[PDB]
Amino acid sequence: DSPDLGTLVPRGSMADILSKLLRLGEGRMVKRLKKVADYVGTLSDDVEKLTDAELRAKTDEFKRRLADQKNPETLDDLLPEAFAVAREAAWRVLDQRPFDVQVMGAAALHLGNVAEMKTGEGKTLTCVLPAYLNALAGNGVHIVTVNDYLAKRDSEWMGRVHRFLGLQVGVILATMTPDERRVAYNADITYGTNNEFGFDYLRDNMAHSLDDLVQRGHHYAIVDEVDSILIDEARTPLIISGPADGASNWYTEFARLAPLMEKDVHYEVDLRKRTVGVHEKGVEFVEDQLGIDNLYEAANSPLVSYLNNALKAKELFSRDKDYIVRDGEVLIVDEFTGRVLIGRRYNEGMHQAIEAKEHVEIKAENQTLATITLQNYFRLYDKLAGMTGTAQTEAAELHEIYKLGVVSIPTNMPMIREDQSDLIYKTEEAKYIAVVDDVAERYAKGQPVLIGTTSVERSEYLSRQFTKRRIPHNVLNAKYHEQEATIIAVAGRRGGVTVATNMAGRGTDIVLGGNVDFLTDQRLRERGLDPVETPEEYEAAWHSELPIVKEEASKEAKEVIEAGGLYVLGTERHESRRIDNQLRGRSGRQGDPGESRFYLSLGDELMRRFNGAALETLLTRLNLPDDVPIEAKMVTRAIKSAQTQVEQQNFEVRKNVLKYDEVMNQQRKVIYAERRRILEGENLKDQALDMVRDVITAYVDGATGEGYAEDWDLDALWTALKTLYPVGITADSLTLLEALLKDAERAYAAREAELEEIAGEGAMRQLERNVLLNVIDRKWREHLYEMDYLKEGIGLRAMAQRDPLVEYQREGYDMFMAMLDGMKEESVGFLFNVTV
Amino acid sequence: DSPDLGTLVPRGSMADILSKLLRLGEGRMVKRLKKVADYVGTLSDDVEKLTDAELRAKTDEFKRRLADQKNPETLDDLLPEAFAVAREAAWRVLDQRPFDVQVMGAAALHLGNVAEMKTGEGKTLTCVLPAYLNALAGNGVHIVTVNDYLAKRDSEWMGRVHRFLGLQVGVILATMTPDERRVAYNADITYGTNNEFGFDYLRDNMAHSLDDLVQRGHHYAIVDEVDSILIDEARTPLIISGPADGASNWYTEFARLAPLMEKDVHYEVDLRKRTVGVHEKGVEFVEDQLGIDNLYEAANSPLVSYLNNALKAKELFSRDKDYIVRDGEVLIVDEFTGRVLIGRRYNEGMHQAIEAKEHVEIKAENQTLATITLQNYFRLYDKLAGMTGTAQTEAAELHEIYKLGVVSIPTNMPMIREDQSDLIYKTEEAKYIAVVDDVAERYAKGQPVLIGTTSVERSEYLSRQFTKRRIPHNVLNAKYHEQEATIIAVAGRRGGVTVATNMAGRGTDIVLGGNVDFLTDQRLRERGLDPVETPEEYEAAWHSELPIVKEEASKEAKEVIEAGGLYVLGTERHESRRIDNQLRGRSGRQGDPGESRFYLSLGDELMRRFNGAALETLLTRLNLPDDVPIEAKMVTRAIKSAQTQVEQQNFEVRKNVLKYDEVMNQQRKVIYAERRRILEGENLKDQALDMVRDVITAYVDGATGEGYAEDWDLDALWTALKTLYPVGITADSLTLLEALLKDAERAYAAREAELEEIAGEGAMRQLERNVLLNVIDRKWREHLYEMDYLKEGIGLRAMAQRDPLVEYQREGYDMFMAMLDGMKEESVGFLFNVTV
Numbered sequence A, B: 001d002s003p004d005l006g007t008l009v010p011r012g013s014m015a016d017i018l019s020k021l022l023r024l025g026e027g028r029m030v031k032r033l034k035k036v037a038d039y040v041g042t043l044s045d046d047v048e049k050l051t052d053a054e055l056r057a058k059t060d061e062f063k064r065r066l067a068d069q070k071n072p073e074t075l076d077d078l079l080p081e082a083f084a085v086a087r088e089a090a091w092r093v094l095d096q097r098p099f100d101v102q103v104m105g106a107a108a109l110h111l112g113n114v115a116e117m118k119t120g121e122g123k124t125l126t127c128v129l130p131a132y133l134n135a136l137a138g139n140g141v142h143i144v145t146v147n148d149y150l151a152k153r154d155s156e157w158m159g160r161v162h163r164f165l166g167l168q169v170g171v172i173l174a175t176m177t178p179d180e181r182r183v184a185y186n187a188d189i190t191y192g193t194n195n196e197f198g199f200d201y202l203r204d205n206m207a208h209s210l211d212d213l214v215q216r217g218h219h220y221a222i223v224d225e226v227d228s229i230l231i232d233e234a235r236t237p238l239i240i241s242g243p244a245d246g247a248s249n250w251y252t253e254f255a256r257l258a259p260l261m262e263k264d265v266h267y268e269v270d271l272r273k274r275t276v277g278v279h280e281k282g283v284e285f286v287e288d289q290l291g292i293d294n295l296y297e298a299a300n301s302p303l304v305s306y307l308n309n310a311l312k313a314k315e316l317f318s319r320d321k322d323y324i325v326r327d328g329e330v331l332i333v334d335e336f337t338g339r340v341l342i343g344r345r346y347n348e349g350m351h352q353a354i355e356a357k358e359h360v361e362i363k364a365e366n367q368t369l370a371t372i373t374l375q376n377y378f379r380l381y382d383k384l385a386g387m388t389g390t391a392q393t394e395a396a397e398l399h400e401i402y403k404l405g406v407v408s409i410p411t412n413m414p415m416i417r418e419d420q421s422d423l424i425y426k427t428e429e430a431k432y433i434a435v436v437d438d439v440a441e442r443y444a445k446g447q448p449v450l451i452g453t454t455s456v457e458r459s460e461y462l463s464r465q466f467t468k469r470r471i472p473h474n475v476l477n478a479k480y481h482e483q484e485a486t487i488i489a490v491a492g493r494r495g496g497v498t499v500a501t502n503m504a505g506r507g508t509d510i511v512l513g514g515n516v517d518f519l520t521d522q523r524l525r526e527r528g529l530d531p532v533e534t535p536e537e538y539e540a541a542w543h544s545e546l547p548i549v550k551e552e553a554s555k556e557a558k559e560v561i562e563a564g565g566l567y568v569l570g571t572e573r574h575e576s577r578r579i580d581n582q583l584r585g586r587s588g589r590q591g592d593p594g595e596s597r598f599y600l601s602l603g604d605e606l607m608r609r610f611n612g613a614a615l616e617t618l619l620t621r622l623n624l625p626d627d628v629p630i631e632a633k634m635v636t637r638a639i640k641s642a643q644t645q646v647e648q649q650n651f652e653v654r655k656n657v658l659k660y661d662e663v664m665n666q667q668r669k670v671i672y673a674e675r676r677r678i679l680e681g682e683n684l685k686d687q688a689l690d691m692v693r694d695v696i697t698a699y700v701d702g703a704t705g706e707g708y709a710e711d712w713d714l715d716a717l718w719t720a721l722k723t724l725y726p727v728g729i730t731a732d733s734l735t736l737l738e739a740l741l742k743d744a745e746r747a748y749a750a751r752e753a754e755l756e757e758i759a760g761e762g763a764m765r766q767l768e769r770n771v772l773l774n775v776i777d778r779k780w781r782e783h784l785y786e787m788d789y790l791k792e793g794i795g796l797r798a799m800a801q802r803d804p805l806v807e808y809q810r811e812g813y814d815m816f817m818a819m820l821d822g823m824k825e826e827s828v829g830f831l832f833n834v835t836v
């Protein structure tokens, strides 16, 4: 809630107004970013006149200035200086100085927006400035790319600038161990994919020791290719699944024991209150049958809950009345119509209790162990930003889900690509002869062509046609990234013909005459050089190799420009207009001439999903020859409309994935926070004592309600608490909650001192932490297994009278509260009686 | 507009009130209809004491009473008596007496409604009363059934009753010649299919001589199976198509000739007007090249138009500016977009002229020669009625399209069939072993089964199963109707197993024990007897052997009854709920016990067209086994919704077929009427002269236009007139509309006399008829070809900013008026100049 008169960088309250007018198309924000970039530009001389050592000393100066409480400075205060330094460093290291528009993009990233910068504007380097600046705070910065090849290349390439400025830079990769990740997350800047960041988030919240955590918070994430990651990939959650590792053998054991026990001798049934109470005689019976002294002595084995469930199974649920058994499944039926309520299961281990009671073999299964959606993962960061060539069409959603604004950064040079209209054909057969014809003409003239398809199979067909017309070309199937980048870096040379299935070679700019940085780096690699493993040698060869590559390139650029620039030829439409435009974008970077054009057909995958075949019937009936392009409003509408439906379907999937994830995101916050407390070694004595109180309170309550006299049930209450803790007073002594509470409170004091007797100095503090973590992990895993089934089956309730999401929340939250209550009372049980 | 107090048969004002309350479900109509049946019932003694002869004579009595201009009586007055006579007649002939409820249905038919009568209620018989009554009027009655086997069996079966009462009954069949047809249409009652009645209508309106007409008007049609014919079959029109009859060789000739002709020597071109005029020298040139004396001398060759078109083609239309040529197609392109205006051809034979000009092969083709939809066909009758077991679900459409009301006739015995709710399975596999088990159990109990499927290939798969299970059975594939009747007639016998694809065996009632009538007829025939070829002996055999047949059926019925009556097992749903119900209705006729049930799967054809796949892989994930019947308000909803959508789609196709047909139906009423005038011999001197008058006016109109002084093209006006007729006043006669018309009339009076010398009195009257019919048929055909193309392509020029149907009408009527104007111009041309 700040002011803004004569502040260069906009602060909070002004920054909002500026984000508002973004969505309204007014573009005042660009005027501002331009003012910032300009200013940074006037600091050029200051840094230009510095020594390499003196430029590197700037980092320590900034840190110093950010810790000064006598003379306070914020990252926002340091932005102009820190940018100027990074900009001059890049120039010295890479031999490329961030353009005025890169500095604009940079400031947008620092302010927490998506900078929309076209293909070829230099997003990779633009990134370095806000990354350097925010790294100074010492909390770490995550840069997200779309695959491992790219995270590795950026971290290694920009890492040179950061390491020069004295920062450490790490990557996380799929192949890396926990130890290796820990080091990478300890760097000042960490590159990686959404897969790696989120899975490490998920693993961390499963870890059984604080030493094993790999990440260190979610401070700032800059998402390269935001639309691919935050929109497209967000349709699908991150899931860790594994063996349910259930209590199958205890279920079986208690289904076996339940019959042997006798009604009203060993246990009581509250016919009315839906409840079973184990008697003194019965507790002994089970104790004897198991060779056991107390029902809570075995770690991770809640025998009380198993027993009670087996008895509830035996007495309160009737086969053919309440459920039936079909093919190894317990299936719940309704009242006295008795129809199979497909999907429903019983709760809190009751279902497994019944399965065992009906001698059903109990299913060894896989289950969810941890999840999060990309949306809720990235929502974790205190600051979020992103870069892409295409974001304005995703703006509303970026703003709703992520609170991310989108700024269109002006292009460095005037964009002059000619983007041609679709050529539409009645059949695939005809489209491809027209495509191959074009390619053949372009190739004769030397103009490099990029052909995009949408399946490997179609790319392979085109490959075969090119081969038969004798046009040499490569096919890139989005399979081997480093390999394919190698081909793409040279795709913009004369005679270039390159087929790219799906968006293959993403992230490697197709620079006319050859991508100069890609190739310099590549020559350096084959000579044994490495930005990280042999940095001095790498840098010194870079400075002499770059100028040579640029020449034998670049005069080649002159020839390609005359040939028309890069020709982009699309073969079908993608699931979105956006992705189509991404392909067009590969041509005409940095002000180059270029042309783009799609060739479509009524027999394309997309059109076949919809009305394409009807249309081709029609046109044949109208006598239009196959090789005549179609220009008709109705067919144009039909193509637009097929793609727009796929877009909308995808949007609704995303929206649904996120809706269902919110329910479980609330729940894991709580659970994950508890696990953290324990892993951190917090003193849990008070929480332990509160649970003890909480459980004894509910028991007393639950047997105390009305009548208000001796006319009550003290025998049920005493025996039930007896297994929970060593009750040390009589129902006789007092012929009440406060009484029972001091006894337990002092029985806990007794138990504590026992643990000093056994393992000494604060050993009760360690028993609490151990018991709770074990209890939370077992109970939460079990809940997850139950929640799997609930997601699935709820769909199967949908009507124009009930919203399925409401129902999933009510039942899913009920389940969660019941889980918490059970977590409490098993904890106090084990706390009192578990073997050490 | 008549009264109702004291009137037995409701008419005019009252009948309507009674139709309204029908769509409202009050059933005062049924109450009225039963009052009529009861009255007819009181007349039973009166007809019972009559001899056969006396009863045969009642017909001449009624006929004489219907004609009596002094003691007037209507069909309504005669209904009670004529019905009592027909009833008694059926009893004597058939040995079955119409039930009270059949008489009710009969009355509903006379009143022009659909009588909804359940399967097994005796619709074939019901029909005889209103058919008899209305046939008395002498105009013909058309009874429509669903195929040739049924039209022949009904005509020969009920034809016995009518023949007994002095009437002739005919059938039309697909095999019959026009002479045979004519005889059948001349009978008092005529049976046939919609195919035959409708195509006879199309041919009649193509006929070249009155001798050749087969039909004699559209007086009363009773449509048996109304829902099948007026709803279901109404989605597709009746088309007679054929070779376009090419003027192809003249097109080519004039394309060869146009080039040898010189601008401003042989012709002139008005560039501003899109017009061409052929000079004296040009007329003569063409004449000499064709060895002809006048371009109007050859009947059926409009040489003036061909020439004129060829000359427009040469001068006014430019290749690669107005049109391009592609795979020997002439395609129109716009001014300087140059893009193909797909769907567009040139008008009035200009297109062929262009094809010819470009030496494009003039493709031998097919076109519509005549059409009408079933809706417009049946709208021709003065009175319409119909019968079916299932019509109320179609009531709104019957009422709006045909003004038919729907009356549910109460059933003769209380219906007691048990329709079970559907059994839904995840996979076809599980459904089909589930089905085979039911059938096997039923077969073992002896209970007869009808198993409905929905494709030949599924019936065969089921057959192959049955065989492997050792269950003898028949597959009826809706292919050979008479053979399939033979089998179906005994399907309600013990051990009976009958698989019926689509609605196989439609029309043959599955009487428990055996359809006794069917069997009696069959037994008589396979000894050589025939209701028509051996009438006396057939009848003798019938009264003798029905009782034998009935006795041995019937004691067999009694067994089949013990076993639960007919079991109907549907295997999948049809394109409508109505049809599902037709299949169910085959069981439990006449008060019999019976059971129906469908077995469905998420894998069924119907479902695979929507979401079945998804539901199955869902259910699979919920671990629901395959043999458990799915009982979920979601899956029930899905199945209903899939069928409801196919239903709605059919309905939209039907409503579309008709709207587009309205336009062309109005055009053919006019053309058919014109053709009729000429076939009938009408004196057309007045119209001939009006045409002459019209054309000269039209020329004087165009040529005199505006400007008014000296500036007038008279030379060019005369030349255009000259080719039409021998103008006998030089334009210098006066130095104008009036004088021309008067000269034209004397030239015509001369012509009328020239014809006299060659043929004699009436010579010109016949020439007029011959010339007009030629001109009409030829331009109508051409127009039909052009409308074909118009309709195919109209959809292609559209939006949510224009209605295709409006533009179709606008363009279609425009072509039509231009066609008529063309007919007049050419007719006067031929009238003056044709060779005799």
Ligand SMILES: Nc1ncnc2c1ncn2[C@@H]1O[C@H](COP(=O)(O)OP(=O)(O)O)[C@@H](O)[C@H]1O
Binding pocket: A096, A097, A098, A099, A102, A117, A118, A119, A120, A121, A122, A123, A124, A125, A507, A508, A509, A511, A515, A516, A517, A518
């Ligand atoms: N300011 C700069 N001066 C010269 N070249 C630059 C500059 N910034 C980036 N480049 C080059 O432009 C090319 C595209 O860079 P990249 O960061 O991959 O762009 P993008 O991700 O925006 O499509 C790279 O070869 C890079 O070396």
Ligand SMILES: Nc1ncnc2c1ncn2[C@@H]1O[C@H](COP(=O)(O)OP(=O)(O)O)[C@@H](O)[C@H]1O
Binding pocket: B096, B097, B098, B099, B102, B117, B118, B119, B120, B121, B122, B123, B124, B125, B507, B508, B509, B511, B515, B516, B517, B518
């Ligand atoms: N009133 C009647 N008395 C006895 N049998 C009848 C009578 N009317 C019809 N039937 C018999 O009932 C059966 C069904 O006849 P049908 O005309 O095909 O009924 P629908 O067309 O109504 O399905 C036939 O075998 C027929 O001979």
Ligand SMILES: [Mg+2]
Binding pocket: A123, A124, A224, A507
């Ligand atoms: Mg990039």
Ligand SMILES: [Mg+2]
Binding pocket: B123, B124, B507, B508
């Ligand atoms: Mg019938």
